[PDB]
Structure formats: C-alpha cells, structure tokens
C-alpha cells in the first residue's frame, strides 16, 4: 500500500572526515520486499574526497530489508511518517564515525537526510590512505530496547595489501510513531560498490539485506 514493491529514494549527505567537509547527493531504487536496492551517488562538494569511500557506503536504507512474515517490519511500518537513526562506527585504529539520519516519504519517494562526522583517523591508516576494498558480508544483530530498534554488528573492510580492517557498528532506529517492535533477529547484509570513476566522485552501490531468525 504505502510501501510499494518498487520504490525510489533520494539521499543528501553532509559531513566531514578528519575535518574535510563534503556533500553528496544521490538517487536510488529497489524492491523493499525483496531486500534489494541500488544507488548512484555523486560528490557535490569537497570532491575528490581525501578518504576511503567505504566508510560512507553503509549510510546511503533499512526500509529495503526482506523480512519473514513472523518478524514485524518495524521500519516499513513507520511510514509514511518514517523514522530516524543514529550510528556509531568504532574502527580498530581509533577512527570514529558518528552518523544521524532522517527517513521520510514524500510524493511516493523515500527522502534520506544524512549527517556524518568522522574523526581521529590516523593520517597513515587505510581510511585516509584510501586502501580499503569494500565490506565483507556481515550480519547485524537486532533487538528492541527502550521503545526503539537497536542493531549491533562486527564489520570488516578488505584491504589492498590483502589484510583486513575491523570496526564495530552500533545503531539505534526509532520510528516517528509508535509501531510494533520485533523480537531479536539477524539481518544478513551484502554491500557492494558496483562501479565508480577514478577519484570516487561518482559511485554506484548495490545492497541485499534479509532478516533471518537468530
């Protein structure tokens, strides 16, 4: 009804990483009930970015998660009003990214507003040196708490030297109206950079996400 089988979205992000300010504008589309989506991002200020694109890619859409019938789809149920989320990403070398986001529905399209602050990344580290090569497939553990939906997950970036660069994600998702929260469950996530230009000022992403029982 409100969330149709094919849905587009528009996303604006403003942020700074190690003090470098930037903006990104993107448009996306996907199949909310099949858990698939793609997005085309364009850097509109601060380009080219002097840091790894990978730290931004997870911020560009949980209305597109395939849920079984016995797990309440809290975030789809939040619409048309929508929801907000806030995220902490702690990286193993001290790098930190904090994100806040608002999701609404306007004229049949999702509208995403993102604010992002990355700090304390070592100048020598893989993020500021652009040595990351995408996220390994991951699983986010979901659980209700204090009237919100929370998720935590261990994440891992592949590196150019064959190594890995690990992070811990904490996110809180809060609907703008009281709708039904699920029990605990797992969301399996595959996030891919499907194409990009040389300086990563134009990037395309694909994500598949599906809720499964713990």
PDB file of C-alpha atoms in Angstrom:
ATOM      1  CA  UNK A   1       0.000   0.000   0.000  1.00  0.00           C
ATOM      2  CA  UNK A   2       2.243   2.789   1.296  1.00  0.00           C
ATOM      3  CA  UNK A   3       5.495   0.914   0.650  1.00  0.00           C
ATOM      4  CA  UNK A   4       5.150  -0.405  -2.890  1.00  0.00           C
ATOM      5  CA  UNK A   5       7.070  -3.294  -4.434  1.00  0.00           C
ATOM      6  CA  UNK A   6       9.270  -0.826  -6.330  1.00  0.00           C
ATOM      7  CA  UNK A   7      10.374   2.349  -4.572  1.00  0.00           C
ATOM      8  CA  UNK A   8      12.844   5.116  -5.393  1.00  0.00           C
ATOM      9  CA  UNK A   9      14.718   7.302  -2.955  1.00  0.00           C
ATOM     10  CA  UNK A  10      16.766  10.486  -2.876  1.00  0.00           C
ATOM     11  CA  UNK A  11      19.601  10.992  -0.400  1.00  0.00           C
ATOM     12  CA  UNK A  12      21.531  14.069   0.713  1.00  0.00           C
ATOM     13  CA  UNK A  13      24.589  13.713   2.935  1.00  0.00           C
ATOM     14  CA  UNK A  14      26.667  16.443   4.527  1.00  0.00           C
ATOM     15  CA  UNK A  15      29.695  15.554   6.562  1.00  0.00           C
ATOM     16  CA  UNK A  16      33.332  15.965   7.471  1.00  0.00           C
ATOM     17  CA  UNK A  17      36.067  13.368   7.920  1.00  0.00           C
ATOM     18  CA  UNK A  18      39.220  14.462   9.762  1.00  0.00           C
ATOM     19  CA  UNK A  19      37.943  17.992   9.221  1.00  0.00           C
ATOM     20  CA  UNK A  20      37.483  17.718   5.435  1.00  0.00           C
ATOM     21  CA  UNK A  21      33.930  18.864   4.702  1.00  0.00           C
ATOM     22  CA  UNK A  22      31.920  17.489   1.794  1.00  0.00           C
ATOM     23  CA  UNK A  23      28.429  16.892   0.448  1.00  0.00           C
ATOM     24  CA  UNK A  24      26.939  14.027  -1.553  1.00  0.00           C
ATOM     25  CA  UNK A  25      23.676  13.824  -3.494  1.00  0.00           C
ATOM     26  CA  UNK A  26      22.285  10.507  -4.696  1.00  0.00           C
ATOM     27  CA  UNK A  27      19.232   8.770  -6.075  1.00  0.00           C
ATOM     28  CA  UNK A  28      18.322   5.136  -5.591  1.00  0.00           C
ATOM     29  CA  UNK A  29      15.736   2.473  -6.306  1.00  0.00           C
ATOM     30  CA  UNK A  30      14.981  -1.019  -5.113  1.00  0.00           C
ATOM     31  CA  UNK A  31      12.429  -3.668  -4.189  1.00  0.00           C
ATOM     32  CA  UNK A  32      11.634  -3.206  -0.469  1.00  0.00           C
ATOM     33  CA  UNK A  33      10.028  -6.622  -0.027  1.00  0.00           C
ATOM     34  CA  UNK A  34      12.797  -8.484  -1.857  1.00  0.00           C
ATOM     35  CA  UNK A  35      15.564  -6.768   0.113  1.00  0.00           C
ATOM     36  CA  UNK A  36      17.453  -5.380  -2.899  1.00  0.00           C
ATOM     37  CA  UNK A  37      18.400  -1.841  -3.873  1.00  0.00           C
ATOM     38  CA  UNK A  38      20.929   0.205  -5.833  1.00  0.00           C
ATOM     39  CA  UNK A  39      22.087   3.799  -5.532  1.00  0.00           C
ATOM     40  CA  UNK A  40      24.010   6.299  -7.661  1.00  0.00           C
ATOM     41  CA  UNK A  41      25.949   8.808  -5.568  1.00  0.00           C
ATOM     42  CA  UNK A  42      27.651  11.992  -6.755  1.00  0.00           C
ATOM     43  CA  UNK A  43      30.053  14.086  -4.682  1.00  0.00           C
ATOM     44  CA  UNK A  44      28.742  17.645  -4.904  1.00  0.00           C
ATOM     45  CA  UNK A  45      31.091  19.484  -2.517  1.00  0.00           C
ATOM     46  CA  UNK A  46      34.567  18.734  -1.222  1.00  0.00           C
ATOM     47  CA  UNK A  47      35.500  16.392  -4.065  1.00  0.00           C
ATOM     48  CA  UNK A  48      37.579  14.491  -4.649  1.00  0.00           C
ATOM     49  CA  UNK A  49      37.313  13.016  -1.157  1.00  0.00           C
ATOM     50  CA  UNK A  50      40.683  12.525   0.589  1.00  0.00           C
ATOM     51  CA  UNK A  51      39.474   9.363   2.333  1.00  0.00           C
ATOM     52  CA  UNK A  52      38.098   5.906   1.607  1.00  0.00           C
ATOM     53  CA  UNK A  53      34.589   5.850   0.122  1.00  0.00           C
ATOM     54  CA  UNK A  54      33.874   2.650   2.064  1.00  0.00           C
ATOM     55  CA  UNK A  55      33.225   4.499   5.332  1.00  0.00           C
ATOM     56  CA  UNK A  56      30.311   6.306   3.650  1.00  0.00           C
ATOM     57  CA  UNK A  57      28.674   3.445   1.752  1.00  0.00           C
ATOM     58  CA  UNK A  58      26.757   1.964   4.750  1.00  0.00           C
ATOM     59  CA  UNK A  59      24.998   5.302   5.327  1.00  0.00           C
ATOM     60  CA  UNK A  60      23.166   5.565   1.983  1.00  0.00           C
ATOM     61  CA  UNK A  61      18.269   2.384   3.830  1.00  0.00           C
ATOM     62  CA  UNK A  62      16.621  -0.190   6.058  1.00  0.00           C
ATOM     63  CA  UNK A  63      13.185   0.127   4.504  1.00  0.00           C
ATOM     64  CA  UNK A  64      14.621  -2.278   1.877  1.00  0.00           C
ATOM     65  CA  UNK A  65      15.128  -5.345   4.107  1.00  0.00           C
ATOM     66  CA  UNK A  66      13.349  -8.592   3.283  1.00  0.00           C
ATOM     67  CA  UNK A  67      11.518  -9.780   6.418  1.00  0.00           C
ATOM     68  CA  UNK A  68       9.685 -13.066   7.002  1.00  0.00           C
ATOM     69  CA  UNK A  69       6.040 -12.745   7.968  1.00  0.00           C
ATOM     70  CA  UNK A  70       6.684 -13.642  11.624  1.00  0.00           C
ATOM     71  CA  UNK A  71       9.174 -10.786  12.162  1.00  0.00           C
ATOM     72  CA  UNK A  72       7.475  -7.361  12.414  1.00  0.00           C
ATOM     73  CA  UNK A  73       8.901  -4.987   9.811  1.00  0.00           C
ATOM     74  CA  UNK A  74       9.175  -2.081  12.241  1.00  0.00           C
ATOM     75  CA  UNK A  75      10.870   0.276   9.792  1.00  0.00           C
ATOM     76  CA  UNK A  76       8.417  -0.280   6.927  1.00  0.00           C
ATOM     77  CA  UNK A  77       5.597   0.176   9.457  1.00  0.00           C
ATOM     78  CA  UNK A  78       6.963   3.606  10.428  1.00  0.00           C
ATOM     79  CA  UNK A  79       5.857   5.149   7.137  1.00  0.00           C
ATOM     80  CA  UNK A  80       4.575   7.490   5.733  1.00  0.00           C
ATOM     81  CA  UNK A  81       5.944   9.401   8.747  1.00  0.00           C
ATOM     82  CA  UNK A  82       9.204   7.445   8.693  1.00  0.00           C
ATOM     83  CA  UNK A  83      11.987   7.032  11.209  1.00  0.00           C
ATOM     84  CA  UNK A  84      15.369   8.345  12.322  1.00  0.00           C
ATOM     85  CA  UNK A  85      18.579   6.505  13.081  1.00  0.00           C
ATOM     86  CA  UNK A  86      21.877   7.297  14.793  1.00  0.00           C
ATOM     87  CA  UNK A  87      25.045   5.259  14.378  1.00  0.00           C
ATOM     88  CA  UNK A  88      28.482   4.892  15.954  1.00  0.00           C
ATOM     89  CA  UNK A  89      31.278   3.191  13.994  1.00  0.00           C
ATOM     90  CA  UNK A  90      34.402   2.476  16.065  1.00  0.00           C
ATOM     91  CA  UNK A  91      37.364   1.394  13.949  1.00  0.00           C
ATOM     92  CA  UNK A  92      40.185  -0.708  15.325  1.00  0.00           C
ATOM     93  CA  UNK A  93      42.832   2.017  14.834  1.00  0.00           C
ATOM     94  CA  UNK A  94      40.890   4.682  16.750  1.00  0.00           C
ATOM     95  CA  UNK A  95      38.964   6.090  13.794  1.00  0.00           C
ATOM     96  CA  UNK A  96      35.390   7.043  14.673  1.00  0.00           C
ATOM     97  CA  UNK A  97      32.359   7.857  12.512  1.00  0.00           C
ATOM     98  CA  UNK A  98      29.093   9.108  14.011  1.00  0.00           C
ATOM     99  CA  UNK A  99      26.014   9.448  11.796  1.00  0.00           C
ATOM    100  CA  UNK A 100      22.464  10.751  12.211  1.00  0.00           C
ATOM    101  CA  UNK A 101      19.766  10.249   9.609  1.00  0.00           C
ATOM    102  CA  UNK A 102      16.129  11.060   8.884  1.00  0.00           C
ATOM    103  CA  UNK A 103      13.956   8.938   6.582  1.00  0.00           C
ATOM    104  CA  UNK A 104      10.633  10.264   5.300  1.00  0.00           C
ATOM    105  CA  UNK A 105       8.252   9.568   2.417  1.00  0.00           C
ATOM    106  CA  UNK A 106       7.342  12.427   0.074  1.00  0.00           C
ATOM    107  CA  UNK A 107       5.436  12.119  -3.215  1.00  0.00           C
ATOM    108  CA  UNK A 108       5.894   8.362  -3.197  1.00  0.00           C
ATOM    109  CA  UNK A 109       9.690   8.503  -2.779  1.00  0.00           C
ATOM    110  CA  UNK A 110      11.831   7.970   0.297  1.00  0.00           C
ATOM    111  CA  UNK A 111      13.785  11.066   1.334  1.00  0.00           C
ATOM    112  CA  UNK A 112      17.051  10.451   3.218  1.00  0.00           C
ATOM    113  CA  UNK A 113      18.926  13.211   5.052  1.00  0.00           C
ATOM    114  CA  UNK A 114      22.315  12.194   6.468  1.00  0.00           C
ATOM    115  CA  UNK A 115      24.827  13.993   8.675  1.00  0.00           C
ATOM    116  CA  UNK A 116      28.200  12.352   9.253  1.00  0.00           C
ATOM    117  CA  UNK A 117      31.298  13.155  11.300  1.00  0.00           C
ATOM    118  CA  UNK A 118      34.474  11.091  11.024  1.00  0.00           C
ATOM    119  CA  UNK A 119      37.302  11.856  13.441  1.00  0.00           C
ATOM    120  CA  UNK A 120      40.597  10.550  14.791  1.00  0.00           C
ATOM    121  CA  UNK A 121      41.514   8.574  11.668  1.00  0.00           C
ATOM    122  CA  UNK A 122      45.314   8.153  11.545  1.00  0.00           C
ATOM    123  CA  UNK A 123      46.848  10.008   8.607  1.00  0.00           C
ATOM    124  CA  UNK A 124      48.803   6.787   7.900  1.00  0.00           C
ATOM    125  CA  UNK A 125      45.796   4.479   8.239  1.00  0.00           C
ATOM    126  CA  UNK A 126      43.864   2.732   5.477  1.00  0.00           C
ATOM    127  CA  UNK A 127      40.953   5.205   5.508  1.00  0.00           C
ATOM    128  CA  UNK A 128      42.904   8.409   4.899  1.00  0.00           C
ATOM    129  CA  UNK A 129      45.251   6.499   2.555  1.00  0.00           C
ATOM    130  CA  UNK A 130      42.349   5.012   0.528  1.00  0.00           C
ATOM    131  CA  UNK A 131      43.474   1.389   0.863  1.00  0.00           C
ATOM    132  CA  UNK A 132      40.093  -0.216   1.631  1.00  0.00           C
ATOM    133  CA  UNK A 133      38.392  -2.511  -0.889  1.00  0.00           C
ATOM    134  CA  UNK A 134      34.832  -2.932   0.348  1.00  0.00           C
ATOM    135  CA  UNK A 135      32.963  -4.549   3.227  1.00  0.00           C
ATOM    136  CA  UNK A 136      32.837  -8.289   3.775  1.00  0.00           C
ATOM    137  CA  UNK A 137      29.308  -9.687   4.011  1.00  0.00           C
ATOM    138  CA  UNK A 138      28.021  -9.109   7.530  1.00  0.00           C
ATOM    139  CA  UNK A 139      25.203  -9.859   9.958  1.00  0.00           C
ATOM    140  CA  UNK A 140      23.571  -7.191  12.124  1.00  0.00           C
ATOM    141  CA  UNK A 141      22.083  -8.375  15.429  1.00  0.00           C
ATOM    142  CA  UNK A 142      18.774  -6.596  16.097  1.00  0.00           C
ATOM    143  CA  UNK A 143      16.933  -6.242  19.394  1.00  0.00           C
ATOM    144  CA  UNK A 144      14.278  -3.896  20.820  1.00  0.00           C
ATOM    145  CA  UNK A 145      15.212  -1.625  23.708  1.00  0.00           C
ATOM    146  CA  UNK A 146      13.612   1.464  25.284  1.00  0.00           C
ATOM    147  CA  UNK A 147      10.979   1.744  22.579  1.00  0.00           C
ATOM    148  CA  UNK A 148      13.471   1.700  19.700  1.00  0.00           C
ATOM    149  CA  UNK A 149      15.087  -0.881  17.446  1.00  0.00           C
ATOM    150  CA  UNK A 150      18.804  -1.320  18.014  1.00  0.00           C
ATOM    151  CA  UNK A 151      21.379  -3.108  15.897  1.00  0.00           C
ATOM    152  CA  UNK A 152      24.982  -4.083  16.534  1.00  0.00           C
ATOM    153  CA  UNK A 153      27.435  -5.809  14.221  1.00  0.00           C
ATOM    154  CA  UNK A 154      31.091  -6.595  13.739  1.00  0.00           C
ATOM    155  CA  UNK A 155      32.252  -5.279  10.378  1.00  0.00           C
ATOM    156  CA  UNK A 156      35.368  -5.885   8.316  1.00  0.00           C
ATOM    157  CA  UNK A 157      36.930  -3.987   5.426  1.00  0.00           C
ATOM    158  CA  UNK A 158      39.182  -5.734   2.951  1.00  0.00           C
ATOM    159  CA  UNK A 159      42.497  -4.007   2.276  1.00  0.00           C
ATOM    160  CA  UNK A 160      44.669  -3.626  -0.812  1.00  0.00           C
ATOM    161  CA  UNK A 161      47.584  -5.400   0.899  1.00  0.00           C
ATOM    162  CA  UNK A 162      45.408  -8.484   1.423  1.00  0.00           C
ATOM    163  CA  UNK A 163      44.712  -7.659   5.075  1.00  0.00           C
ATOM    164  CA  UNK A 164      41.615  -6.557   6.933  1.00  0.00           C
ATOM    165  CA  UNK A 165      40.482  -3.503   8.886  1.00  0.00           C
ATOM    166  CA  UNK A 166      37.798  -4.107  11.504  1.00  0.00           C
ATOM    167  CA  UNK A 167      35.048  -1.968  13.016  1.00  0.00           C
ATOM    168  CA  UNK A 168      32.122  -2.248  15.427  1.00  0.00           C
ATOM    169  CA  UNK A 169      28.767  -0.719  14.425  1.00  0.00           C
ATOM    170  CA  UNK A 170      26.104   0.446  16.895  1.00  0.00           C
ATOM    171  CA  UNK A 171      22.833   1.817  15.528  1.00  0.00           C
ATOM    172  CA  UNK A 172      19.523   2.897  17.056  1.00  0.00           C
ATOM    173  CA  UNK A 173      16.427   3.104  14.836  1.00  0.00           C
ATOM    174  CA  UNK A 174      13.385   4.995  16.158  1.00  0.00           C
ATOM    175  CA  UNK A 175      10.078   5.274  14.307  1.00  0.00           C
ATOM    176  CA  UNK A 176       8.357   8.653  14.313  1.00  0.00           C
ATOM    177  CA  UNK A 177       5.155   6.995  15.583  1.00  0.00           C
ATOM    178  CA  UNK A 178       4.616   4.014  17.890  1.00  0.00           C
ATOM    179  CA  UNK A 179       4.541   0.893  15.705  1.00  0.00           C
ATOM    180  CA  UNK A 180       5.234  -2.719  16.570  1.00  0.00           C
ATOM    181  CA  UNK A 181       8.810  -3.671  17.504  1.00  0.00           C
ATOM    182  CA  UNK A 182      10.193  -7.114  16.608  1.00  0.00           C
ATOM    183  CA  UNK A 183      11.929  -9.554  18.865  1.00  0.00           C
ATOM    184  CA  UNK A 184      15.621 -10.223  18.393  1.00  0.00           C
ATOM    185  CA  UNK A 185      16.721 -11.406  14.934  1.00  0.00           C
ATOM    186  CA  UNK A 186      19.601 -11.156  12.441  1.00  0.00           C
ATOM    187  CA  UNK A 187      19.848  -9.075   9.264  1.00  0.00           C
ATOM    188  CA  UNK A 188      22.303 -10.531   6.736  1.00  0.00           C
ATOM    189  CA  UNK A 189      23.859  -7.798   4.611  1.00  0.00           C
ATOM    190  CA  UNK A 190      25.884  -7.770   1.389  1.00  0.00           C
ATOM    191  CA  UNK A 191      27.018  -4.285   0.337  1.00  0.00           C
ATOM    192  CA  UNK A 192      28.865  -3.876  -2.975  1.00  0.00           C
ATOM    193  CA  UNK A 193      30.439  -0.996  -4.859  1.00  0.00           C
ATOM    194  CA  UNK A 194      29.316  -1.953  -8.363  1.00  0.00           C
ATOM    195  CA  UNK A 195      31.026   0.873 -10.293  1.00  0.00           C
ATOM    196  CA  UNK A 196      32.914   4.112  -9.708  1.00  0.00           C
ATOM    197  CA  UNK A 197      35.045   6.630 -11.544  1.00  0.00           C
ATOM    198  CA  UNK A 198      38.747   7.126 -10.850  1.00  0.00           C
ATOM    199  CA  UNK A 199      38.501   9.610  -7.965  1.00  0.00           C
ATOM    200  CA  UNK A 200      35.268   8.148  -6.493  1.00  0.00           C
ATOM    201  CA  UNK A 201      33.270  11.298  -7.200  1.00  0.00           C
ATOM    202  CA  UNK A 202      30.669   9.114  -8.971  1.00  0.00           C
ATOM    203  CA  UNK A 203      29.823   5.805  -7.280  1.00  0.00           C
ATOM    204  CA  UNK A 204      27.165   3.114  -7.663  1.00  0.00           C
ATOM    205  CA  UNK A 205      26.260   0.678  -4.876  1.00  0.00           C
ATOM    206  CA  UNK A 206      24.164  -2.457  -4.528  1.00  0.00           C
ATOM    207  CA  UNK A 207      22.884  -3.935  -1.281  1.00  0.00           C
ATOM    208  CA  UNK A 208      20.982  -7.089  -0.416  1.00  0.00           C
ATOM    209  CA  UNK A 209      19.598  -7.370   3.113  1.00  0.00           C
ATOM    210  CA  UNK A 210      17.395 -10.061   4.646  1.00  0.00           C
ATOM    211  CA  UNK A 211      16.111 -10.699   8.154  1.00  0.00           C
ATOM    212  CA  UNK A 212      16.566 -14.223   9.490  1.00  0.00           C
ATOM    213  CA  UNK A 213      15.874 -15.820  12.881  1.00  0.00           C
ATOM    214  CA  UNK A 214      18.847 -15.856  15.319  1.00  0.00           C
TER     215      UNK A 214
END
